């Protein structure tokens, strides 16, 4: 209903701002997988347990949320909410612009004989230790691209604050045994890694 930038970025120590722009404030922070928390109320004020970095601004045409001296733990989703029912400002993801790029490690596992015996087959492509969290996964049967039967995860943060991902290419034993080899091709920041397996093995 309301309007905010879909994305904002800054490096640690910088000062970032989130904009919120007649009929219609409070601000809420949301870490992944947890409920939202009251960040700003009355437009200038913070409850107890909110640092001094966060500062809200009213201008009467619009509202703003300024974070000064951005930190690592500030990487989260931020929401704007005014009023007449309660109007919500839509989503804004704040991503800290620290750390350098990391090249993905790709491990490709062929179907086990037990799975083949079970009249099934799956190619498992596991991708680790890459930053940023943007990767594209392409499967190939004998150098010919395959898209049917592909299931890939949205990348997610590991324990070391790099990203992991995993792609699965489900198959029939026939299809598996048919071709000479299958390939998992991971592309990341203009660089490609192609792992390959074969039924012969």
């Amino acid at each position: 209903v309301l309007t905010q930038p879909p994305s904002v970025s800054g490096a640690p120590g910088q000062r970032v701002t989130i904009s919120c722009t007649s009929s219609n404030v409070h601000w809420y922070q949301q870490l992944p997988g947890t409920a939202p928390t009251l960040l700003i109320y009355v437009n200038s004020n913070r409850p107890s347990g909110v640092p001094d970095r966060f500062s809200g601004s009213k201008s009467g045409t619009s509202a703003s949320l300024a974070i000064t001296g951005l930190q690592a733990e500030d990487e989260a989703d931020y929401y704007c909410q005014s009023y007449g029912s309660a109007v919500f400002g839509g989503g804004t993801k704040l991503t800290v612009l620290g750390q350098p790029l990391a090249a993905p490690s790709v491990t490709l596992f062929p179907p086990s004989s037990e799975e083949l015996q079970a009249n099934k087959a799956t190619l498992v492509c596991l991708i680790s230790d890459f930053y940023p969290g943007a990767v594209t996964v392409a499967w190939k049967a004998d150098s010919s691209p395959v898209k049917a039967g592909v299931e890939t995860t949205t990348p997610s943060k590991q324990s070391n604050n790099k990203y992991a991902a995993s792609s699965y290419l489900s198959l029939t034993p026939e299809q598996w045994k048919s071709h000479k080899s299958y390939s998992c091709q991971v592309t990341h920041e203009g660089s490609t890694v192609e792992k390959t397996v074969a039924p012969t093995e």
Binding site: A35, T37, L38, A86, T107, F109, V124, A165, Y168
Partner: protein, 220 residues
């Protein structure tokens, strides 16, 4: 101290009905208005409307004026969200919040996941990912367990009954178009350990009440 506590996760099939609870404590329920918020996966916060803890007359947002019902039990000091004729699009986390009136929305419930899927509860099909040294350095082999087709989440995976921790990597599960979950967990172990050392994959799925211990042997 002030607190809102909601019910646990709810797995339902389409057409079913669900009751989500919101237990308030630390203050008097009737003095503040309870509002309901919805958040579907990967989405923003949807304001659903609010119930009048004074009267108990609910007010819904349009489109929530349908099969959604807000009920109240001041005796137990609890606010209830009822959803009938559940649909796949109802798959979401639901929050109850209190309107301090200048403050928000100052307090929230932890959130209640309602999952609506035609998928029946299914135990995992566990297969062994045999050792591969190609992507691993330092004279070391990567092995694992492929946990195929289970519903719903979560699934637990340990190695050697927990005696093996270092060098383990359990990848988050993919939601296929089935729908069902597939997950894969790999452990990285010295090349010399094979085949003298035994490595067992302990997979546990509470929803199916299923456990599987799968030995991972090197090769043919």
């Amino acid at each position: 101290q002030v607190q809102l506590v909601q019910s646990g996760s709810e797995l339902k099939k389409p057409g079913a009905s669900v009751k989500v609870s919101c237990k308030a404590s630390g203050y008097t329920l009737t003095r503040y208005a309870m509002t309901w918020v919805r958040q579907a996966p990967g989405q923003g916060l949807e304001w659903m409307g609010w119930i009048n803890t004074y009267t108990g007359n609910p007010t819904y947002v349009q489109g929530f004026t349908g099969r959604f019902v807000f009920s109240l039990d001041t005796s137990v000091s609890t606010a209830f969200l009822h959803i009938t004729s559940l649909k796949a699009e109802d798959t979401a986390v639901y929050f109850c919040a209190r309107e301090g009136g200048a403050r928000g929305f100052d307090y929230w419930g932890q959130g209640t996941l309602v999952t609506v899927s035609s998928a029946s509860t299914k135990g995992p099909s566990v297969f062994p990912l045999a050792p591969s040294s190609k992507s691993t350095s330092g004279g070391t082999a990567a092995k694992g367990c492929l946990v195929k087709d289970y519903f719903p989440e979560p699934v637990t995976v340990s190695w050697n009954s927990g005696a093996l921790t270092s060098g383990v990597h359990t990848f988050p599960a993919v939601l296929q178009s089935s729908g069902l979950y597939s997950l894969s967990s790999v452990v990285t172990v010295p090349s010399s350990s094979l085949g003298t050392q035994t490595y067992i994959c302990n997979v546990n799925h509470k929803p199916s009440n299923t456990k599987v211990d799968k030995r991972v042997e090197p090769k043919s």
